[PDB]
Amino acid sequence: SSSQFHGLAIGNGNSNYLQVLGLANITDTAYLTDWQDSGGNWHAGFALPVPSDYPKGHFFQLTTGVGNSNYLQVLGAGEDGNPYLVSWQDGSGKWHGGMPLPKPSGYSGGPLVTGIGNSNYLQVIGARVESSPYLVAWQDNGGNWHAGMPLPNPSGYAGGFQQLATGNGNDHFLQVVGVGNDGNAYLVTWQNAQGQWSPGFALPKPSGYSGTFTQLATGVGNGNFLQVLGIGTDGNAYLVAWQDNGGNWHPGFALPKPSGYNGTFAKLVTGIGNSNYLQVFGIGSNGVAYLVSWQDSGGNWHGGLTLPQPSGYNGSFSQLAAGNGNSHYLQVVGTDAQGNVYLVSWQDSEGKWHAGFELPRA
């Protein structure tokens, strides 16, 4: 067993129990690091069962997706250059070895991103775009996987993308946003309820900022309004743009920073907090794990705070990830400097944050 990780991914499994996935340091072996029960108790995991067609397989990136019958799917970028379903988890919590994804012609191995598409069909998309965007594969509601295809570039641009991210927009339509190789923020493409993909366009720039971005992340905001957050090349955190319930996009603005903090951010992730208030987390230029900002139910943004340090560790985290656990309490997990997985902090129904702890070793 390995106990130190990188490349965490987080999702909900059987009975919505939170599952923290990871790549072992040195070996890049896919693991369940830990999982949390309905009492909030954390349990050590174990190496995930790998595909019979990649039987000693290793991955340089992982991500999760909710599949058929809400079976948690763990997707991985093979170190053999192929995309995989590493493993899936059934409704009893048992994990099963996966399979290679039915990828399209012209797809070149890289990191994956998932989204929930039409009829809830899980979509697995290439998260970096060297030429045209690709849907690697999609999964029907009986669990069957289907061959991918190219996806549309946005209006006016075919320069490739550093990063694609996904979120659900108006009428549940999947939106795929990306940071171009030109540093601009795009809606790359969006998918309607019948599964058809349309070209996107440049997202409106945030208030007062004409510059470029290095990273995007999405979050479900007030009124179910999709929010696209970003890190500027300036080092600041932004709401780049948000989408209304009619599908139209509106400009964002620089996020309000935690009181007293004058540094930069990177490694931005979102979470759904108390009263479903959207939370935005990030890592400071001082190494500190922060709630950058949170958004109330009216859409108003509020400066964040230093996340209350977990017991016995006053160091920095190299990655943060978030999800909802027992009673819907928001959990922020991360990897310390060695790669030990911590609950950095958890948040109660009132919005108050509580110090976490180093989770049990896989």
Added chain:
Amino acid sequence: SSQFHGLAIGNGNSNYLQVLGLANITDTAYLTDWQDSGGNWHAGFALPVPSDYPKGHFFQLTTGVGNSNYLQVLGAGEDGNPYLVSWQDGSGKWHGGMPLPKPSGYSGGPLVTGIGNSNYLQVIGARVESSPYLVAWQDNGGNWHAGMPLPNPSGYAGGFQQLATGNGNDHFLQVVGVGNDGNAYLVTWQNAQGQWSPGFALPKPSGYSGTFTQLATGVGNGNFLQVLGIGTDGNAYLVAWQDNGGNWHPGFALPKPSGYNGTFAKLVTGIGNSNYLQVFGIGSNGVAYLVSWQDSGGNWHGGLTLPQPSGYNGSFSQLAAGNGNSHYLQVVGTDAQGNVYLVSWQDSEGKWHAGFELPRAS
């Protein structure tokens, strides 16, 4: 990009120290920074990629010294192929590389190099799922040749989490490994004809019969080859060392920095003042340490906290070490965001000095 992971270090033209790394999010291979003979640091740029993989990306990098003392940057392609990403000539110019010829059965993964018979550069699979592999070797005229499977240690064949290389004064190339069993092995060595032989379990360190998560080699007193390890107990060990007759001897737990009671991970070695072997690692408190250092009588000494660099009081997620101007040992690292810092540098007298953030790659 200016935030990185997966740093590698080597010495290039005029022995100028070179810091290589992988851009965060995109996994693009970069020279992050280099240092001149006066000690001054300089921003890097994206490496030129192989014309057979012209928008390529990599999940791991390493370096070796090639024909004509040309620095070679090897990379594990996200397409599943091992590559020479780029090579540098004696003027400092970088050249796009090529896919390595590879043997049947080699499965894409991280690479490690070593210098073999006839100083031919050897690129070896750093993780072993079946048999150890020589991926490729380079001849004295710079041409690459496909490798072959290499021996296993006597009657262990369970694969290896990690391989490392080093040489004794007898020159023979030694390949050490942590088995999937957690045990340390001499996996194989290459004799004076370039032929490889089965190895054996290394001597275990006095006072610890448990398993290991990582090894690293270092050249110590009298150029004696030392195998360092991180125990599954989280402690740092000299696992074993090799004498001038090529016999192996058991080591012992390293003398820890006085006062320090936590664990270490992410161990790397460096050659310090007076060629004294230095061992570095990252604590469970998130702090970067010199774990121990060894004098010319071969005696080990407790280490210290590396002096925190200017402008950052957080943790580093990776340390890498190399000799720069006037041989001064440089310890570089990635902060929590991925910004590359000189963590600390050591003067001629063995005294460590606070570093600073490096120039950002363009």
